[PDB]
Amino acid sequence: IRMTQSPPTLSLSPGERATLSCRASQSVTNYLVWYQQKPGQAPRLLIYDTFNRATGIPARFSGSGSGTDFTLTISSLEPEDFAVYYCQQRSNWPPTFGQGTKVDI
Amino acid sequence: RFASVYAWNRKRISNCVADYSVLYNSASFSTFKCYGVSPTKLNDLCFTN
């Protein structure tokens, strides 16, 4: 059971929308969590369990997807929200984090 | 500890005041399926066993 994030680095301006995909080696349901790690900070978590984001994360962050294919969407973040993103599962032991996707301009 | 399924445990209910809304709204349940009753009427219908 190994995660993977297949879209590589992207160059989306401060505007527009971004859509990031995370797979799984087998069936995982409502068990993923998203992290946004800046250069040299602690990886801040984003989304509880595929659908509800935690406190202090705005509405432009959305998390969806099901089956074995999951997606995080930035509607229109802002002029800073460029970091690396990770998808993690809490189905069984232990929580694998995958690969990661950067964004540039 | 619970029991194994070949010998499932059982327990009846006697004179009581049984709450049912506070059991449902804990929001950690994999399956909560009520079949012959709606999950919103328990808080009001008496039973016999």
Partner: protein, 120 residues
């Protein structure tokens, strides 16, 4: 919730180091914790797990046999006990919470803020 980790520094290849993780806020028992390393310039990868009392500890690759994780809820902390190390697992380390034991446990997740260990 809060998590404070301690035990970082510079060592030699073949010493030991007390990796301790202190928790408050939420109840430290009824809750599954684990560690996760990151070598600077890499992604993320886990170390070892402990299950709400010492009865079942799972380990990762190439850390089985140098790492003895133990918790003790009568003094509410967590330990890795890095022991007889290598000069290649210089990294940052985080203690995090897997979550949940009973039905009423209201699963929430939280992370530390890192502990840096370096070799010679």
């Amino acid at each position: 919730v809060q998590l404070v980790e301690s035990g970082g520094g510079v060592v030699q290849p073949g010493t030991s180091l007390r990796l301790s993780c202190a928790a408050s806020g939420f109840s430290f028992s009824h809750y599954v914790m684990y560690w996760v390393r990151q070598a600077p310039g890499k992604g993320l990868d886990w170390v070892a797990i402990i299950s709400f009392d010492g009865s079942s500890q799972y380990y990762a690759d190439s850390v089985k046999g140098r790492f003895t994780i133990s918790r003790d809820n009568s003094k509410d902390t967590l330990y890795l006990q890095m022991h007889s190390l290598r000069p290649e697992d210089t990294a940052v380390y985080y203690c995090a919470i897997h979550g949940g034991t009973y039905y009423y446990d209201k699963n929430i997740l939280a992370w530390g803020q890192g502990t840096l260990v370096t070799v010679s």
